[PDB]
Amino acid sequence: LMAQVFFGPTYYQRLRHMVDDKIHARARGPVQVLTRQPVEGRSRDGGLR
Amino acid sequence: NEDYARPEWMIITVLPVPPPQVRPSIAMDETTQGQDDLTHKLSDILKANINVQKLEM
RNA sequence: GCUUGUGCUGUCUUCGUCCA
């Protein structure tokens, strides 16, 4: 490489936010009883606002 | 407006009772379901109406 | 011929994530 590279060990930490705990998709599913709109929440297979 | 908004209609003499779709009940657990707030308020209103009718006669 | 199994509350509160 034409440019030299800064290089060495550094202390890194893994945070709790992982993509597989955030990915969510919905085509159709449960709806609220009062308004008949998609429910809220990824855990409940909800929709996006 | 004579046809649509008559002044004496601002005093309630008959109350419309909404269908259960407006005040749905919720099952709090596997056995006991919960009455909605509007249902309880309508029950209180109807009890007061019955009380007034009984007292008057 | 023994024939397959469909359904989920609600209201608060808190703590967080990304912008700001």
Q: Label residues B4-40 b or e (16+ Cβ within 10 Å = b).
A: eeeeeeeeeeeeeeeeeeebeeeeeeeeeeeeeeebe
B1-57 residues near strand C (Cβ < 7 Å): 26-28, 34
CA distance B18 to B41: 12
Tell me how the structure was determined: cryo-EM
Q: Is the Cβ of A34 closer than 8 Å to some Cβ of chain B?
A: yes
User: What resolution in Å is listed for this PDB structure?
Assistant: 3.4
Secondary structure of residue B34 in the 3-state scheme: strand
